[PDB]
Design an enzyme around this catalytic site. Structure first.
Site, short mmCIF file in Angstrom:
data_model
loop_
_atom_site.label_atom_id
_atom_site.label_comp_id
_atom_site.label_asym_id
_atom_site.label_seq_id
_atom_site.Cartn_x
_atom_site.Cartn_y
_atom_site.Cartn_z
N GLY B 15 28.22 37.50 38.76
CA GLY B 15 29.13 37.07 37.69
C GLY B 15 28.64 36.08 36.66
O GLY B 15 29.43 35.56 35.88
N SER B 21 30.20 29.99 32.71
CA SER B 21 30.81 30.79 33.78
C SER B 21 31.01 29.90 35.02
O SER B 21 30.20 29.01 35.27
CB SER B 21 29.85 31.90 34.20
N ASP B 66 26.77 46.78 38.86
CA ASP B 66 28.10 46.99 38.30
C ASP B 66 29.00 47.05 39.54
O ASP B 66 28.90 47.99 40.34
CB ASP B 66 28.09 48.31 37.54
N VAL B 67 29.82 46.00 39.72
CA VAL B 67 30.66 45.87 40.93
C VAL B 67 31.74 46.97 41.06
O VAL B 67 32.30 47.11 42.13
CB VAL B 67 31.31 44.47 41.07
N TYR B 157 49.21 35.37 32.84
CA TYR B 157 48.22 35.69 33.82
C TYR B 157 48.56 37.05 34.45
O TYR B 157 47.68 37.71 35.01
CB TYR B 157 48.13 34.56 34.86
N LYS B 164 44.85 38.34 42.29
CA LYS B 164 44.30 37.18 43.00
C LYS B 164 45.03 36.93 44.31
O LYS B 164 44.43 36.47 45.26
CB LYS B 164 44.28 35.94 42.11
#
Lengths: 260, 258, 258, 260
Positions: B15, B21, B66-67, B157, B164
């Site tokens: 990431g 970041s 690439d996740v 959000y 999350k």
């Protein structure tokens, strides 16, 4: 019918496939209190399964609904709009996950199972809430079902724990969106209930017995327990509660180790 | 290099897009403490962007990943297996959601956005953990990032809150699975780091107990806890690194509304 | 001495009764990292018991302190003010409750035990924090200890569960108060450390994700996080250091009932 | 009286001093549903304040009770045992803290305030629960009141936040102790309600307005909201819930920042 707590309230219950389920227990409680209910059924194939349940509850409107198909959901709400013009409550009692993945480790969950489980078990509630909103013109109450696996690791649940955590979070966000119109959105976190005389799953026998012997009330959750909580949240009694997940589990959620 | 807390520990940080970041703050902190780090980058097209970050950290291994793509993740772990033979830590600091649906209402979330956000922001961690496990033969520590919007409604959000919350739950289930191999799995719930974002940052500044915003260094600190031997005893946890914001039940009476 | 994480930090550790204490594990960990520590002991009568512990740690300042007595606490902080001029950290690792009422039912708790347990196990932390504050002129970190019995019913923990829940709440309120001075306030919720106690230990071993018990070193590790600069960004938090026990919703199917 | 949800249920409500309080809102709801209620009053001095409230609810049994005096509590239960022989519910709506310490910082709390606040606001419930237990022979329901200050820091609350966290924890432990006899123990975490036309406390105006504008339902909690939740938990509807703190706060507990 035994009372009038839901008299004049119209609502759709999604997930009544037999007389053993939480959804049935909710349907019975709200019908017993004077509600006018529509029951959904998955497809023409299962109409025969739902009809007798409906007849026995006094339900006159049954409607197809496959929650994974947006058009099916839209059509169902169209039917309710045409028949009733408005809606007072919705009960979402629907979950799906791959049964073969439940037996293994969460970490080995497949992408297809994750996405399908999330779609049906979590996203469908959001979509359903969006469709209910314009019909719920005199406020109302939208209710879903959850389970302690959302909060803590329990056996034979795996990705459904993750889906139910998502669901419980979505309840909070939805409550904010729908609350200005006085639509409440809540969940019942139900203890396990025996639906099958033998599921043939040792973990399920284990879950049931562990809850029975270790819950504060020293018994399992019943359909009537869940019905009573649904009556609270879906009637005027529950007007001041939204965004909440209420435990209807005989107290199991408080146990940190074991009854002694 | 400022210390030896992570000496002899090898791990991959997923990431690191720029030097702002959360992933970067964690990388800097573990590199400063002696970790041997591999940084992923999305594809060759974007390799030039990770290169100078890697170079300033002293990172010598960068690997495409690439996740959202199982084969990409598999190949990244195969590279690490070939280069290192084992792995001590993984940091997953990646999230995606439709920026326009964030600006609307949660109730208007589309299926495609829900599923895409869930795949990248939540499932990718579980898959990655599944691929890391065989390499983590001397225990280890797997770390993801979350936010208070998992627990309470944070405006705009929207679906990321729901993702999350799913992620924090997955941390618990993964802790049970990977704990058998002495692998810890934890999350840091980070405060916003110093339009919509500005408002949130300002709000957290005025209302956090410490009356300041979370920094990259704060997050690096907590990551050092969880990823080093200091944190051997904690798993399944989401640690708040948010200057105390999580304990506040109402806007401070001493703060202006904004 | 193994590191310099706590170099130049001065603090007082309250609750070191023997070398099995959580307080001892934290003391050893912060001393190994370069902290200058003062250890309290209850009164002169028990000074001989703390002496060799202090000596093995390299502690050169020990100070009498009965946490139930406001004047005793005041005098202990006056000593630290005179010796050091300022303070960087406080560790509060002290609890008391009637041992016989623990063996009974919570509903049979007496007033005297409730109040005494609450005074020593909960209020003393707030008072101590009030006395530490004026000395903590370059920010700092104040740490207490809790247990999962604050969150869920643990049999025969009874009134201590209620006291620890009060303590964890107090951590939040104190974080808001002391955050203005950049002082962090946090708790470690520790697992039982390796009759009634044995059963609990065994239960945690079989059912914790990591399939082992919490150690003093685990707790020292987390204390090093929160008390050092690593933890500047976290306040009001209760961090679980319990090998993951807190995420378990039921006895493991793979564990024997006991 | 408007329904029968509490018909045949006898219970004592502790804390009704006026017609503006949560305790009054609970008394009104359960009396309206057919409950037989005893109201307590602090001492002979205040009997005159309680009598008219009692008369208006149809209550025939009022009893002195100062919850800080164990003999007063014991006497009150003796009176209920003599009059009724058994008990179906108890409502504990009592809290105390030093008002002057609320205005300042939590960290400056005094020992006397801490211990008195803990005694009255938390321990009294435990003691009351122990006295109720032997009278509650056909199961029952014991209910207390809490507030979001137990979970999160809110203004002008200080040591009461700590007392309410203790209370909410005690509810869990009590539920285990009393659950074998099918006695449920629960709390309602009520949003703030205006009891005073002017409290003269700016923080209270602030708390009320912040809850009103930022709660999902965009209004304040009412006495009726709390009454409805008490009806759930105290009637047969609530049989399957114990150890729980249910939020009756118009959704405020879900808000992480502000309504937008």
């Amino acid at each position: 019918r035994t009372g009038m707590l839901m008299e004049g309230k119209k609502g759709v219950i999604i997930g009544v496939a037999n007389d053993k389920s939480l959804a049935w227990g909710i349907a019975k409680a709200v019908c017993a209190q004077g509600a006018e209910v529509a029951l959904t059924y998955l497809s023409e194939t299962f109409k025969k399964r739902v009809d007798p349940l409906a007849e026995s509850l006094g339900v006159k409107l049954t409607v197809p609904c496959d929650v994974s198909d947006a058009e099916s959901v839209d059509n169902m709400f169209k039917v309710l709009a045409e028949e009733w013009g408005s809606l007072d409550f919705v009960v979402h009692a629907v979950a799906f996950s791959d049964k073969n993945e439940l037996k293994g480790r969460y970490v080995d969950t497949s992408l297809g199972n994750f996405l399908t489980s999330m779609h049906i078990s979590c996203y469908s509630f959001t979509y359903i809430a969006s469709k209910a909103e314009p019909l719920m013109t005199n406020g109302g109450s939208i209710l879903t079902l959850s389970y302690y696996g959302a909060e803590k690791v329990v056996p034979h649940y795996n990705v459904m724990g993750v889906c139910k955590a998502a669901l419980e979070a979505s309840v909070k966000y939805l409550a904010v969106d729908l609350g200005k119109q006085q639509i409440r959105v809540n969940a019942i976190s139900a203890g396990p209930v025996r639906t099958l005389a033998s599921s043939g799953i040792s973990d399920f026998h284990y879950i049931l017995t562990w809850n029975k012997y270790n819950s504060p009330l020293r018994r399992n959750t019943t359909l009537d327990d869940v019905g009573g909580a649904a009556l609270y949240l879906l009637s005027d009694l529950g007007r001041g509660t939204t965004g909440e997940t209420v435990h209807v589990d005989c107290g199991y959620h408080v146990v940190g180790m074991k009854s002694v």
